[PDB]
PDB file of C-alpha atoms and ligand atoms in Angstrom:
ATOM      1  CA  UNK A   1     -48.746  48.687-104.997  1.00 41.74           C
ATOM      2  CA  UNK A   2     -49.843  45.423-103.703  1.00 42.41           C
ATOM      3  CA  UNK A   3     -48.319  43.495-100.558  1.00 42.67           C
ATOM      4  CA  UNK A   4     -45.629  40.829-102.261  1.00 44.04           C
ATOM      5  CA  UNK A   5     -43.767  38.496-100.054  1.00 45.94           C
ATOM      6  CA  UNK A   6     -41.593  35.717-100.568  1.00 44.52           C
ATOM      7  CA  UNK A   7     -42.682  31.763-100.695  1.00 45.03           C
ATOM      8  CA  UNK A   8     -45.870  30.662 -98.724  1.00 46.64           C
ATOM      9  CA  UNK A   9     -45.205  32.063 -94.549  1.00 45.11           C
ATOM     10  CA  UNK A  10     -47.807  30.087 -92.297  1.00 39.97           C
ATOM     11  CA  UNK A  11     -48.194  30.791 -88.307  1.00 40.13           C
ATOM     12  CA  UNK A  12     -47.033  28.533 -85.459  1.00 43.83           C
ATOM     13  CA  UNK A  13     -47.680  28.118 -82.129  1.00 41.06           C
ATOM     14  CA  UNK A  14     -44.700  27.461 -79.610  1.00 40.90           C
ATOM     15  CA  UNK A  15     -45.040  24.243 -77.568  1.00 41.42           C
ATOM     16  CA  UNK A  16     -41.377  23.458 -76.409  1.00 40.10           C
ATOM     17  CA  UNK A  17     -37.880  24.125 -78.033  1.00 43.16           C
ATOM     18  CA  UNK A  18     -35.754  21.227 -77.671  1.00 43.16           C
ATOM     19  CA  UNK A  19     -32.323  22.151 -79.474  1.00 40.52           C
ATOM     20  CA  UNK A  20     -31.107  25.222 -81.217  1.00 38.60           C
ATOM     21  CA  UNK A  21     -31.933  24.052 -84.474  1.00 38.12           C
ATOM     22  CA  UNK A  22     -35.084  22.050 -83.444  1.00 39.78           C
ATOM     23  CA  UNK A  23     -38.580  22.664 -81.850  1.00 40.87           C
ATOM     24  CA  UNK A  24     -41.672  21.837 -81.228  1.00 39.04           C
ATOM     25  CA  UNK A  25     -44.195  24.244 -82.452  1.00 36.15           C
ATOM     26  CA  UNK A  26     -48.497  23.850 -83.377  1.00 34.36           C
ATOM     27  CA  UNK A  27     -49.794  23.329 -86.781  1.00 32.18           C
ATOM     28  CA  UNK A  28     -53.001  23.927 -88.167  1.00 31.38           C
ATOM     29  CA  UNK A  29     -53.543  21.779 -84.830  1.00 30.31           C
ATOM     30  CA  UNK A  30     -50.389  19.512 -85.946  1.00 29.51           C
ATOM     31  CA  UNK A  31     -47.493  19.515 -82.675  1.00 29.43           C
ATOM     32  CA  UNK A  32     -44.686  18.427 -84.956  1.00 30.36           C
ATOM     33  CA  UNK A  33     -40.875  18.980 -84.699  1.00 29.99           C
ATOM     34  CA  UNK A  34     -39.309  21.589 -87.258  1.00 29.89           C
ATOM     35  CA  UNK A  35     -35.348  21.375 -87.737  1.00 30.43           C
ATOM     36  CA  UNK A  36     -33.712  24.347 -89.168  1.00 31.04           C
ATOM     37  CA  UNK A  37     -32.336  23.732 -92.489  1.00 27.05           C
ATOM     38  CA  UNK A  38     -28.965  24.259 -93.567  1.00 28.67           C
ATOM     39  CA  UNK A  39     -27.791  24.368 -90.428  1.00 32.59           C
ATOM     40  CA  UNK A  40     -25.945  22.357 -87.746  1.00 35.09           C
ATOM     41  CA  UNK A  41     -25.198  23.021 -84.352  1.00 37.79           C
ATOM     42  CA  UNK A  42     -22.098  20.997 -82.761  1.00 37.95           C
ATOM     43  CA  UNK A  43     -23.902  20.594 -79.111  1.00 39.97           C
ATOM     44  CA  UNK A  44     -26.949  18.294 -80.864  1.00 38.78           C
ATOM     45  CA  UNK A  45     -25.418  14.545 -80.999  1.00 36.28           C
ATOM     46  CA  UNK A  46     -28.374  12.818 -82.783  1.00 34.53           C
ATOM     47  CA  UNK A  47     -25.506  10.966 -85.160  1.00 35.16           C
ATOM     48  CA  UNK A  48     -21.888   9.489 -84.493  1.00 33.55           C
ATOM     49  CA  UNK A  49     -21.031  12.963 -85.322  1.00 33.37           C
ATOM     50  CA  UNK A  50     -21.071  13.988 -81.655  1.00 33.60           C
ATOM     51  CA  UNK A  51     -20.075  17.306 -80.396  1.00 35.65           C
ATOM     52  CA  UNK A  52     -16.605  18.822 -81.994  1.00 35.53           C
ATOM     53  CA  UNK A  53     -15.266  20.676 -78.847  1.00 35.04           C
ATOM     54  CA  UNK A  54     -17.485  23.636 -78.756  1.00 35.26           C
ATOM     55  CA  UNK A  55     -20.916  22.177 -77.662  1.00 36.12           C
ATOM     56  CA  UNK A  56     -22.040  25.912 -76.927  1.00 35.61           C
ATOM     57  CA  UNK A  57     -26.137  26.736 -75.129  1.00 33.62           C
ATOM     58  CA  UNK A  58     -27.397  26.798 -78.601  1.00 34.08           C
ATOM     59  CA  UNK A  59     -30.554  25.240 -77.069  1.00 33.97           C
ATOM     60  CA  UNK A  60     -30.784  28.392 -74.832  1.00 34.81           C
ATOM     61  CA  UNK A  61     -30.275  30.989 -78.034  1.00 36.32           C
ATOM     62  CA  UNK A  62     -33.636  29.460 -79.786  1.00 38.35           C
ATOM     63  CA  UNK A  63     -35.023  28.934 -75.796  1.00 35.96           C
ATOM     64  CA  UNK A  64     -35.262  32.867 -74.890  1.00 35.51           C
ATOM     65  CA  UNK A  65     -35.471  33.143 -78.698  1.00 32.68           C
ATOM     66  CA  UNK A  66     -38.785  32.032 -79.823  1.00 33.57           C
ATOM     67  CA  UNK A  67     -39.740  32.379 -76.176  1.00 35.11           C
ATOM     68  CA  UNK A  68     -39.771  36.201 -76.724  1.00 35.43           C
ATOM     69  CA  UNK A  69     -40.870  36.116 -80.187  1.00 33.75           C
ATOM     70  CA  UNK A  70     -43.990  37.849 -80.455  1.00 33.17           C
ATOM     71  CA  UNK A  71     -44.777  35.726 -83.362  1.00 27.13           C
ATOM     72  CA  UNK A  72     -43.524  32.804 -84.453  1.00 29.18           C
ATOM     73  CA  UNK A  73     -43.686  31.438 -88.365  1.00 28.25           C
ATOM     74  CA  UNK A  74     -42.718  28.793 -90.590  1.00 25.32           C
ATOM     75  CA  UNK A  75     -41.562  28.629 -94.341  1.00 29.55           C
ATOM     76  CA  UNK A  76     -41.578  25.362 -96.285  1.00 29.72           C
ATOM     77  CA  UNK A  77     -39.449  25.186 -98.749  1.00 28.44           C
ATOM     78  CA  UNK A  78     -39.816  24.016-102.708  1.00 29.71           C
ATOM     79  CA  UNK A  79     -38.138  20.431-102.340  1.00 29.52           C
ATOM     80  CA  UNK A  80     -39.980  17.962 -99.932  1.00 27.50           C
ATOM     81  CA  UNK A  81     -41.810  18.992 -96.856  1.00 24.81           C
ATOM     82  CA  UNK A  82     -39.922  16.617 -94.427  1.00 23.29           C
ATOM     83  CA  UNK A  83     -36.963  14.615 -93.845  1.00 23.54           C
ATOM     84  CA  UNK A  84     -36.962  10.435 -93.414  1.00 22.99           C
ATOM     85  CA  UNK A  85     -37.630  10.851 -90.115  1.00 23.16           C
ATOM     86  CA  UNK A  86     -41.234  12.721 -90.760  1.00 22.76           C
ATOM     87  CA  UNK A  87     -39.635  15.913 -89.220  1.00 26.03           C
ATOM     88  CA  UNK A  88     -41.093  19.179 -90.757  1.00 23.04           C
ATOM     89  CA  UNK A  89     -38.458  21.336 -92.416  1.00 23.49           C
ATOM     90  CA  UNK A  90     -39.124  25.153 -92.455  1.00 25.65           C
ATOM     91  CA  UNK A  91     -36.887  28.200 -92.133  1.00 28.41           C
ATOM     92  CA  UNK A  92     -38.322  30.121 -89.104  1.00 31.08           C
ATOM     93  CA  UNK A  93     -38.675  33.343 -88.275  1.00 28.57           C
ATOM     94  CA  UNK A  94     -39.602  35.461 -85.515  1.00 26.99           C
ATOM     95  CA  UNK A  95     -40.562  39.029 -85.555  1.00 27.66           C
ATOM     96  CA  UNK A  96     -38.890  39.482 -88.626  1.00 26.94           C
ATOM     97  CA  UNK A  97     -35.594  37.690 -88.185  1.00 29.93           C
ATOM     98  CA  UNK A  98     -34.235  34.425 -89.512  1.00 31.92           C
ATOM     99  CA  UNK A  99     -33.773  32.390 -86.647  1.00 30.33           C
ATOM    100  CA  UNK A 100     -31.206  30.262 -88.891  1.00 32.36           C
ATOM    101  CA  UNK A 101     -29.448  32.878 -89.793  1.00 32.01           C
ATOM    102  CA  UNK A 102     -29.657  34.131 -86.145  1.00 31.58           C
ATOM    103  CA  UNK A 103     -27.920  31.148 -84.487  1.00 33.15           C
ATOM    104  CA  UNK A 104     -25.188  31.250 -87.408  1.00 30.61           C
ATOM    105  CA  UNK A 105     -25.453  35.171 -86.645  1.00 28.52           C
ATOM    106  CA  UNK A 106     -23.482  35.031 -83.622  1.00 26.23           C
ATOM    107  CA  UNK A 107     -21.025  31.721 -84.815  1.00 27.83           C
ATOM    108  CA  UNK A 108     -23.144  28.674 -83.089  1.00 29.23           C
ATOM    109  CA  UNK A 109     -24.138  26.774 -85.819  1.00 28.95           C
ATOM    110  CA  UNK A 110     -22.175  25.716 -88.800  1.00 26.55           C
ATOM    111  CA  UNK A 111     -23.722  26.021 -92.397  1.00 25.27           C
ATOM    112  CA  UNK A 112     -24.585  22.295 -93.796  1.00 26.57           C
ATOM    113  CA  UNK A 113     -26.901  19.804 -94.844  1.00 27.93           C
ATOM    114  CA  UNK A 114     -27.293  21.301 -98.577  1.00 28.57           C
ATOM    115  CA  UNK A 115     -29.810  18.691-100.716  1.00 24.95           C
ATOM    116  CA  UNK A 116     -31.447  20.895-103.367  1.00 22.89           C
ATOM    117  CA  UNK A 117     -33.715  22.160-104.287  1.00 17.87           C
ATOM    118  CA  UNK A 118     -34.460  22.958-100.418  1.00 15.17           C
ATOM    119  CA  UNK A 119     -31.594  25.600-100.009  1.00 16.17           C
ATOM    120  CA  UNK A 120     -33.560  28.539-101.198  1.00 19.76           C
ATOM    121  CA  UNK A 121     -31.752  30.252 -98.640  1.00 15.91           C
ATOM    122  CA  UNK A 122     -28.188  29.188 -99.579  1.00 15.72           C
ATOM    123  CA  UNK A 123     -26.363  32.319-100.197  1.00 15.95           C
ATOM    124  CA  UNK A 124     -28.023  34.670 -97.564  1.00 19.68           C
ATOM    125  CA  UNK A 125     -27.165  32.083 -94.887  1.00 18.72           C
ATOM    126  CA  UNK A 126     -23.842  31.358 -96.523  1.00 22.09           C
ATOM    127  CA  UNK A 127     -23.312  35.301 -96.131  1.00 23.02           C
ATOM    128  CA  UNK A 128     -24.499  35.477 -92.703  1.00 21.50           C
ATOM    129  CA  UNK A 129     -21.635  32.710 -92.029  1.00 21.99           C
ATOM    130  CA  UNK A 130     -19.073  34.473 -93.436  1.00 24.57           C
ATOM    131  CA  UNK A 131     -19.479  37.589 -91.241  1.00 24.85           C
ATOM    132  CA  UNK A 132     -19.823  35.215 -88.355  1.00 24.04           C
ATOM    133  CA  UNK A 133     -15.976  33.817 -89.032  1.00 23.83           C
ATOM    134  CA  UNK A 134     -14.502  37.219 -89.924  1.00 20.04           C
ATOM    135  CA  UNK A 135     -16.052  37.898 -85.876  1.00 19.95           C
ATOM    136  CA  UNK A 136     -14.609  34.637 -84.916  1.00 21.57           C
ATOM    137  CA  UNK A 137     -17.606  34.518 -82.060  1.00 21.24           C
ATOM    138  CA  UNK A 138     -17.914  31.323 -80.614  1.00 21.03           C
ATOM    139  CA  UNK A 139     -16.466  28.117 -82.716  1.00 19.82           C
ATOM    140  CA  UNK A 140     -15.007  30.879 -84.971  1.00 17.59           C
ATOM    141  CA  UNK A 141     -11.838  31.083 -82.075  1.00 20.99           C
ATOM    142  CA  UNK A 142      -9.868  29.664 -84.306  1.00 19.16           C
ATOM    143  CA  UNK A 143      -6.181  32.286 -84.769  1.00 23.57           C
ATOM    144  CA  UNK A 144      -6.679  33.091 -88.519  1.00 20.82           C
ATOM    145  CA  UNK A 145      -3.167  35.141 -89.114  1.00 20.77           C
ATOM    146  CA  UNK A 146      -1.841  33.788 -92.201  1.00 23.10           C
ATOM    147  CA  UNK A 147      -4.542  32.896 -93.477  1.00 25.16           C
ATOM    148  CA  UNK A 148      -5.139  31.050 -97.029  1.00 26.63           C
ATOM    149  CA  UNK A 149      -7.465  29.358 -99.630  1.00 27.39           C
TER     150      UNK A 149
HETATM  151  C1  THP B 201     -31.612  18.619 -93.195  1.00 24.37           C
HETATM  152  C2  THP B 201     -31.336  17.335 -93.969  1.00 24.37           C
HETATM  153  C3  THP B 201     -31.091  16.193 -93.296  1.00 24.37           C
HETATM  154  N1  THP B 201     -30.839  15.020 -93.953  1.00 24.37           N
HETATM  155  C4  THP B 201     -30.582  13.773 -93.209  1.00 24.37           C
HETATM  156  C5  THP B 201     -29.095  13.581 -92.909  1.00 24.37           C
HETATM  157  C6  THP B 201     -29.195  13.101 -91.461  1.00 24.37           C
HETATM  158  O1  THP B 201     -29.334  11.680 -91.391  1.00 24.37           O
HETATM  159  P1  THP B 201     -29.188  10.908 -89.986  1.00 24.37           P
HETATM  160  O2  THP B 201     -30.499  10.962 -89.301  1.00 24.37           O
HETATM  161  O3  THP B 201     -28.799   9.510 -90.274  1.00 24.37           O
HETATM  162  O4  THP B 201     -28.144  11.600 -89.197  1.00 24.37           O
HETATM  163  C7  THP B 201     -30.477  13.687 -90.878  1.00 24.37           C
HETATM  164  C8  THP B 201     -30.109  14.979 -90.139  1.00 24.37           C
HETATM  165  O5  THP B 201     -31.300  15.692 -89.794  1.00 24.37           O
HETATM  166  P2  THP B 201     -31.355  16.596 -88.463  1.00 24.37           P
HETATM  167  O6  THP B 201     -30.486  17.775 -88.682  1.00 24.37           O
HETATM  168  O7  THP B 201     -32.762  17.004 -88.251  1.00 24.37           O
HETATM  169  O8  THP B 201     -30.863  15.773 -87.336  1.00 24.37           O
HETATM  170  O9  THP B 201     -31.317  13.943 -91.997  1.00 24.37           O
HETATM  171  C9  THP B 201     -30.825  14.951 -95.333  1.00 24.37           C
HETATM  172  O10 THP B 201     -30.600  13.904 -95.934  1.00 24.37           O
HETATM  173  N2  THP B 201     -31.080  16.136 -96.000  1.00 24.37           N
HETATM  174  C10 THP B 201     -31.343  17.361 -95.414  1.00 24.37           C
HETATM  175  O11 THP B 201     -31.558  18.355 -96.108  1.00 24.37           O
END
């Protein structure tokens, strides 16, 4: 009977995309930098981590992403509203879809960072990964034959 929806979803404006998994988008007249959570693509060095060996154009998935989304959001989740570094953490979305569980739609970024309680969103992006390795698209090349626990 009356519209229910899930969590508090605010508007965003898009200034620039920078990664897959990170952008710059307007708040309430705040530019800040969100970072999708649960999520890490190999081609984004910030750490010693460094790129595996598939360092993929996930900047160019979110690019002509949000770039044709006709409206771009942002959902905070329950545990704290940014990281250490003051970066805003938000699952977007973008005329309808989950742009995190878009990227590890098509096997470019890997499931991770998990620090409850922000991981609402564990098992539907945890599903959306396992379809994504079944495909093997992208880092999913691996030659799963025998396969085995
Ligand atoms: C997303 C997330 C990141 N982090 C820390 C680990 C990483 O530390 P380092 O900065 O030392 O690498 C950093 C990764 O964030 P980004 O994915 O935005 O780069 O934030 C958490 O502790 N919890 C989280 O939920």
């Amino acid at each position: 009977a009356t519209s229910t929806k899930k969590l508090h979803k605010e508007p965003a404006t898009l200034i620039k995309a920078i990664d897959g998994d990170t952008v710059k988008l307007m708040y309430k007249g705040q530019p800040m930098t969100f970072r999708l959570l649960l999520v890490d693509t190999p081609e984004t060095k910030h750490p010693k981590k460094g790129v595996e060996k598939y360092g993929p154009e996930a900047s160019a998935f979110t690019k002509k992403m949000v770039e044709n989304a006709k409206k771009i959001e942002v959902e905070f989740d329950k545990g704290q509203r940014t990281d250490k570094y003051g970066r805003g953490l938000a699952y977007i979305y973008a005329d309808g879809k989950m742009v995190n569980e878009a990227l590890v739609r098509q096997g470019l970024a890997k499931v991770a960072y998990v620090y409850k309680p922000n991981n609402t969103h564990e098992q539907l992006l945890r599903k959306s990964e396992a379809q994504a390795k079944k495909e093997k698209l992208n880092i999913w090349s691996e030659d799963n034959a025998d396969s085995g626990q």
